[PDB]
């Protein structure tokens, strides 16, 4: 939340190419160097959400102790690529068709697809916002476009 509001909040962040690259590396290094933890956490969150929400749906109100870091995570991804001053089509990291698909690109693409499979109603918005952020940079445009189009070929 702090990275989303305080860092990128600066319109001067818009300026330095090397700011974007460093943060890009910090964000890409997390799923590459410790995805086990990452997945653990994802699943945990999805599940807890579902459970408490459904429980409340019977007649209660959702517990004030909720924490949607995934949604904040999806918004962060959406905001980070939303606009790049460099316009180097960095978002290309989100797309897997040079390289025989670098393992990193495959895992990330799997991440984007895995998040679309049995999407809880609470994650629906953060996921769209994530996609919105990932479809910048024309090549990326086309690729994510097609990807999602076909994934819908029922997923909300």
């Amino acid at each position: 939340l702090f990275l989303t509001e305080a860092v990128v909040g600066s319109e001067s962040f818009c300026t330095d190419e090397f700011f974007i690259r460093r943060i890009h590396k910090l964000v890409t290094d997390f799923p590459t160097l410790m995805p086990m933890k990452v997945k653990q956490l994802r699943n945990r969150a999805e599940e807890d959400a579902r459970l408490i929400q459904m429980s409340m749906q019977m007649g209660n109100e959702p517990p004030a102790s909720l924490r949607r870091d995934l949604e904040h995570l999806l918004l962060l991804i959406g905001e980070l690529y939303r606009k790049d001053p460099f316009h180097l089509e960095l978002a290309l990291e989100y797309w897997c068709p040079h390289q025989r698909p670098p393992q990193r690109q495959v895992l990330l693409s799997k991440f984007v697809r895995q998040m679309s499979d049995l999407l809880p109603a609470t994650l629906y918005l953060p996921y769209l916002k994530m996609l919105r952020g990932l479809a910048s940079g024309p090549q990326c445009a086309h690729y994510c476009f097609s990807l999602l189009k076909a994934n819908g070929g029922g997923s909300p």
Partner: protein, 321 residues
């Protein structure tokens, strides 16, 4: 005689009453009271905690059928009213010499377990672990017994007379206090299963003892007609000893908010059971209440407020600090 500050009507006679001493995560203070054949769990909110409450908001949350006269109630530290995982756990002793552990989710899941092995009446019981896994009990069989939640006896201490009160030490791990009817208070280590120390009362019978939660060096008790205070480790002799009641003191409880304030009750007597609230700086009680016939004495966790059970009523006294 001061009138009670607040009074709540009950279905039947109140034999025991205990506030939850733990944080349940609710805005209201949990209260348990035992009748002739039932245990009621209620939430209390007071005007002194919330300015939207006029006097006392008393809400019954759950009633448990017990089938026997309840003599003592102990809250489990695991007791929480949080909406995500509500858990009510408490233990009771009754006239049938059995302990009952109740567990509830405040919904449909209501379980109880019976623990057997005392050969005499149980006089008092407490949870004796920070984790709420272990129960200590004392009785007329001259034993202090330690139980898991599975009803297995973990330990047993042979007493020299009937055990009259039991209390877990509020800060120090493994220290159980046991008050014996003949005036001896013993401390047991539950790790080593050994008696560490004793205190002796000048008067007998010793009827109730409690730890000062705000000053873990202080112990208060009632023996004969008098209230007695010890300060550890300075002496095995009382620091203070003064009259509590004209005819037999029964219960002693320390205030949870003030280390100089405590309440005592007289024995279920012809002159309607007196509650006396004492302050150590004063030679006389600061408040004298009358309850027509009352058993159980408990202090609110935060407020300078005590409760006594009576004939179909709970009586509350606020003490001006």
């Amino acid at each position: 005689a001061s009138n009670a500050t607040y009074t709540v009507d009950c279905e039947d006679y109140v034999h025991v009453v205990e506030f939850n001493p733990f944080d349940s995560g609710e805005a209201g203070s949990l209260l348990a009271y035992g009748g002739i054949s039932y245990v009621v769990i209620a939430s209390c909110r007071f005007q002194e905690e919330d300015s939207t409450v006029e006097g006392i908001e008393f809400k019954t949350l759950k009633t448990f059928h017990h089938g026997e006269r309840v003599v003592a109630i102990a809250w489990s530290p695991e007791t929480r009213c949080d909406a995500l995982l509500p858990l009510l756990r408490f233990a009771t002793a009754a006239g049938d010499k059995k302990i009952r552990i109740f567990t509830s989710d405040f919904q449909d899941k209501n379980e109880y377990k019976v623990i057997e092995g005392h050969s005499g009446y149980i006089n008092d019981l407490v949870f004796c672990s920070p984790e709420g896994t272990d129960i200590a009990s004392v009785g007329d069989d001259h034993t202090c017994r330690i139980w898991d939640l599975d009803g297995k006896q973990i330990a047993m201490f042979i007493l020299r007379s009937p055990g009259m009160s039991v209390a877990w030490h509020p800060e120090g791990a493994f220290k159980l206090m046991v008050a014996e009817k003949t005036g001896t208070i013993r401390f047991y280590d539950l790790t080593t299963h050994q008696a560490i120390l004793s205190l002796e009362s000048v008067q007998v019978p010793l009827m109730s003892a409690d730890w000062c939660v705000r000053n873990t060096l202080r112990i208060g008790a009632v023996a004969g007609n008098d209230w007695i205070i010890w300060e550890m480790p300075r002496s095995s002799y009382p620091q203070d000893n003064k009259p509590a009641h004209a005819d037999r003191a029964r219960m002693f409880r320390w205030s949870k908010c003030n280390e100089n304030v405590f309440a005592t009750t007289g024995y279920p007597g012809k002159m309607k059971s007196q509650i006396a609230i004492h302050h150590l700086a004063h030679p006389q009680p600061i408040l004298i209440g009358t309850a027509p016939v009352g058993s159980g004495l408990s202090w609110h966790r935060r407020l300078p407020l005590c409760v006594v059970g009576g004939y179909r009523k709970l009586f509350f006294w606020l003490t001006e600090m």
